[PDB]
């Protein structure tokens, strides 16, 4: 097997993605496996039923490839608080994210159905 042949694994193996809720505050998670990175500007959130507060994305590092030229991007973990300052019963949050391979692959756009707890204003 030429080099890098054996990279195009399960993007949920290539993004491990996880959560943590604890009342008012939320913790998204994603493992990013080496030679693995996420792009910064294609993280979308999306609160239904839910209000949270404005989600600040951390500083991640400049790369370059072929599909944007320079972009910043994230890797070995990516760690993001969200504050839920209201959830009704049954709220959710949408989680959308893109991510790439060194060895030279996108994947397409990944989404995830974040079940929140209810939170009373």
Not at 22 to 43: A, E, F, M, P, V
Not at 50 to 70: N, R, S
Not at 88 to 108: E, M
Request: glycine share 6%; charged share 20%; proline share 7%.
């Amino acid at each position: 097997d030429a080099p890098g042949r054996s990279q195009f694994v399960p993007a949920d193996q290539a993004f491990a993605f996880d959560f943590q809720q604890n009342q008012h505050d939320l913790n998204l998670t994603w493992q990013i496996k080496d030679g693995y990175y996420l792009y910064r500007k294609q993280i979308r959130i999306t609160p239904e039923h839910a209000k949270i507060a404005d989600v600040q994305l951390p500083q991640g590092v400049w790369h370059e490839d072929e599909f944007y030229g320079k972009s910043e991007i994230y890797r070995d973990r990516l760690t993001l608080p969200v504050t839920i300052n209201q959830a009704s019963a049954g709220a959710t949050l949408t989680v959308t994210y893109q991510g790439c391979a060194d060895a030279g692959f996108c994947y397409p756009p990944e989404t995830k159905t974040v079940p929140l707890s209810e939170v009373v204003a």
